[PDB]
Design a protein around this nucleic acid. Structure first.
Ligand SMILES: Nc1ccn([C@@H]2O[C@H](CO)[C@@H](O)[C@H]2O)c(=O)n1
Ligand SMILES: Nc1ccn([C@@H]2O[C@H](CO)[C@@H](O)[C@H]2O)c(=O)n1
Ligand SMILES: [Ca+2]
Ligand SMILES: [Ca+2]
Ligand SMILES: [Zn+2]
Ligand SMILES: [Zn+2]
Lengths: 543, 543
DNA sequence: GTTCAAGGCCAG
DNA sequence: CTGGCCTTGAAC
């Protein structure tokens, strides 16, 4: 499917591909290996599919966060560049290409938020958030705002929050801890409450989105806005005289934006891994290669030290690199999705004032965080055998998705409330945006009883955006051959996909919800026999 | 429009009207004069309009504060009850129905804040505010707060503030002094700093509102709350065992809640003024009449001495009357509105810590306190004639309303700062809530110049909730007769209603902003002639 | 003395 | 087979 002696490179349309193609022409001139660069559409989507088939490009350029998902699917070769080459680039950029303890791509370019101020309105920008209210009151008298940015999305408000002891997941020796989230913290609450103190006094109306702040800053209304290089071009045509500089410091500590690293990764299916490493290390990652790419379309800051020094002569790019070094690498692991969501609401609720700060942040932390089951508890509660009728507690492992896999976890029995009802209360306390459907998956020790089938099927009638599937280990009946079969048929009428957990489902649960301590799943005796038994009884019930 | 030999009575819906109707039935049984009681909606709003047309009710029941606004519009008949009858009611209640030196209504009922405590948690309530922090530390150990009330509104926090030499306006014999405000005082600062000392140690979280404190007290969390009789019914259904007692004393002096007096006023347009006085003096204001009204819906404490003694057997009502006698009558004059606002913010800014105490209180006092303009200075500075070009200070009288007339005053020239810019700095230092529009009115010696016009029109672009109208005595100029006209046309574009002061405007200013010593306005020669002349030049300028 | 995981036997 | 019922070894 994929050739030898030929290099195929995939790069997005907004990044300069003509300069990269000219680099490949230099590589072909010197070596004889012909290089072809392509800028397809949705290549961040196209690449996983074509690569799962042993096809696709030899090299893939994209932001480093997606590369973690590519690395979990084994689509990326491991690279071991000499430490003599690892120096050549800034050290923190090599951490963005590290997944599960091994390097999966080459750092190329750097992006991060930075402070954009009006030089005419502000000849000397403030170095601290603490000076912002005062400044605003002086500029609210000329009909101007001091600062406006995209307060809705968490990528923009997060730097102030994380400036003081705030973080998503602690990093260590090239691996994140999904169990630990610094969303709830003294300093995170300090930054968020400072934000709220700005919006209460209406230094920021709190309804500000990206376009309201871009229209505001670009038409001369606001003196400062927090944004990245992606928008620079616009401000250059607005004729506004401006500048980029360090994001202000809260409590004296630098604020921490989320750094995105444009990276070049190697397809694991490629026979040209070494050809690729030679091209990347000796032709792309040079002053001449990155400059040739840059003249076509900007790269922002670059990871290559020498060329980054040549580019820092631009004060804007210098600011980008400075805020990047004072910030934190945007994590590449899956749980980050559940993070964004769990934060995207928590700031908004604390912004409008419809929820207090510590409530929004505690709810955010416990939402986007790990809770893992026990192994002995799981093995005991989920055994599908005979003689399992003597089990009382029902356990329920859940996954909420849309495909963005949001929160996951497990619930158990508590004071007469069967688990299904507790999940109804959990997903009800959790707000919903009924313009988008959600796909909710259940893994239950016992299938729902009649009361649970009726309550759940009703909840499903009322929120028709939700679509539920239920995998149960065991079929529950009290007063056999009357009620629960009709209840399960009632959930069937409501369109609930009811299956009985097969072996692959027990693997999924074992590696998804349980704390296995890297232990392989161990099937007990009679698992498959009881599974096709119970699935037979179920096919007898519904149909 | 309004009948003779018939009495029509207006009373709010929350006050017992069936008992009052039975009193009117007794009056009809004795005299033959039929009495009809009605409880319309927004009768406090409906009454001024219907009465301005010589219509409406014969008698109106409402809190005494609104009656001052009815008295200024001449809608209330003056009453001269014999001293023998005035001795029947408590003397301080007669000061609440006194406006501009003459009685306008009959006192009926009395309301005031009182201390409500949990008898189970607190068998012996503290008599002094000084004991409150210690008691809180003892109850913070059982999971309870000692005291929680509505710290947002000034009606609730004012008793402690005024406990030591604090007051709104000094009252010399039924007459308030708008020029004197005791908001800034040694004892006022003592009470406010003690409140801040309670919120720094978090004996009160300072975000507490009326409903947070009612839910807290009624669910058993807090041991004491400061409230009035309006909420008693709720605490009765909460099954909480409680009591009402004296508000605690600060520095040994009784704290001063604001006393509200439910009053019965006579419509000045009624031919039945004497029928009304007979019904009120001999049928309503009796033990039998007030008891008949009370059995239907409670009146709280009453102004009639004998029946008040009969009701004091209820220790709650006795507490209400005691705090009322130790408090001060809530003034009925218009400036009280500027008072509430100027105080509502001043305590909040001193509560959060975003403004020091003496700053919040000095800003509050100078905010809500009259400030009046020398007659000679006004007459000199506002003369519209010719030969007025030789005047170089510019004065500006302002009114800020929403309807709701907040602060008024005048402003003048400074070291190169024209007035308009000084007013921009004043209304900027004054905070704004950009969810509500404000209507600001100007009265200026000179119309704004080009720099003024531009700065003001910009301020209006940035704060689009403000709507400005400018009345000017004179039109200003400087060579570029071109400009002073284009600047005024730019303010016209911004939506500023520009008019030139007519005679009625001079009357308004003369009786609103000037210290006239009760002297009628004296127009100089050529006022009207120069007025239509300048108005002609202005029409010629804008259109 | 007791409660439970597990498994087998027998009668529908 | 599916469901009902005893035996057991072994664990608090
Ligand atoms: N869907 C279901 C059905 C049943 N159960 C368990 O069975 C008992 C009902 O009497 C309950 O004690 C309950 O533990 C459950 O947990 N979930
Ligand atoms: N709109 C205006 C215009 C002018 N002025 C006062 O009049 C003088 C004009 O030179 C100036 O000295 C200035 O003080 C003013 O007070 N307000
Ligand atoms: Ca969770
Ligand atoms: Ca004032
Ligand atoms: Zn159930
Ligand atoms: Zn001016």
């Amino acid at each position: 499917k994929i050739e030898e002696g030929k290099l195929v490179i995939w790069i997005n349309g907004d990044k300069g591909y003509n300069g990269l193609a000219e680099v490949g022409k230099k590589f072909e001139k010197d070596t004889g290996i012909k290089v072809t660069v392509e800028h397809p559409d949705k290549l961040e989507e196209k690449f996983p599919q074509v690569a799962a088939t042993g096809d696709g490009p030899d090299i893939i350029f994209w932001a480093h966060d997606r590369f973690g998902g590519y690395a979990q699917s084994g689509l990326l070769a491991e690279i071991t560049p000499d430490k003599a080459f690892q120096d050549k680039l800034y050290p923190f950029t090599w951490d963005a290409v590290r997944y599960n303890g091994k390097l999966i791509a080459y750092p190329i370019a750097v992006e991060a938020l930075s402070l954009i101020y009006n030089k005419d309105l502000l000849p000397n920008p403030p170095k601290t958030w603490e000076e912002i209210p005062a400044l605003d009151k002086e500029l609210k008298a000329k009909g101007k705002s001091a600062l406006m940015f995209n307060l809705q999305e968490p990528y923009f408000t997060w730097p102030l929050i994380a400036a003081d002891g705030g973080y998503a997941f602690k990093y260590e020796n090239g691996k994140y801890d999904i169990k630990d989230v610094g969303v709830d913290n003294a300093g995170a609450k300090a930054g968020l409450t400072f934000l709220v103190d700005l919006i209460k006094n209406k230094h920021m109306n709190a309804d500000t989105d990206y376009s309201i702040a871009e229209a505001a800053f670009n038409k001369g209304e606001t003196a400062m806005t927090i944004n990245g290089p992606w928008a620079w071009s616009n401000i250059d045509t607005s004729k506004v005289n401006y500048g980029v500089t360090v994001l202000p410091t809260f409590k004296g500590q630098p604020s921490k934006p989320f750094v995105g690293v444009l990276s070049a990764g190697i397809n694991a299916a490629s026979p040209n891994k070494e050809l690729a490493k030679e091209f990347l290390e000796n032709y792309l990652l040079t002053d001449e290669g990155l400059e040739a790419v840059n003249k076509d379309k900007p790269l922002g800051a670059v990871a290559l030290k020498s060329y980054e020094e040549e580019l820092a002569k631009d004060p804007r790019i210098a600011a980008t690199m400075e805020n990047a070094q004072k910030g934190e690498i945007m994590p590449n692991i899956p749980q980050m999705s559940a993070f964004w969501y769990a934060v995207r609401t928590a700031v908004i609720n604390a912004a409008s004032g419809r929820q207090t700060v510590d409530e929004a942040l505690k709810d955010a932390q416990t939402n986007a965080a790990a809770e893992f089951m026990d192994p002995a508890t799981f093995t005991y509660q989920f055994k599908n055998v005979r003689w399992a009728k003597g089990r009382r507690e029902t356990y329920l492992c859940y996954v909420v998705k849309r495909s963005e896999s949001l929160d996951f976890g497990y619930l158990r029995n508590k004071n007469g409330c069967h688990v299904a009802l507790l999940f109804l209360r959990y997903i009800s306390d959790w707000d919903l945006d009924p313009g988008r459907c959600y796909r909710v998956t259940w893994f239950t020790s016992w299938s729902p009883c009649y009361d649970c089938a009726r309550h759940v099927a009703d909840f499903l009638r009322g929120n028709p955006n939700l679509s539920l599937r239920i995998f149960t280990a065991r079929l529950y009946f009290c007063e056999d051959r009357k009620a629960e079969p009709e209840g399960l048929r009632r959930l069937a009428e409501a369109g609930v996909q009811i299956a009985i957990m097969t072996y692959k489902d027990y693997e999924y649960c074992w590696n998804t919800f349980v704390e296995n301590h890297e232990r392989t799943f161990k099937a007990w005796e009679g698992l498959h026999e009881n599974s096709v038994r119970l699935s037979r009884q179920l096919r007898r019930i519904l149909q």
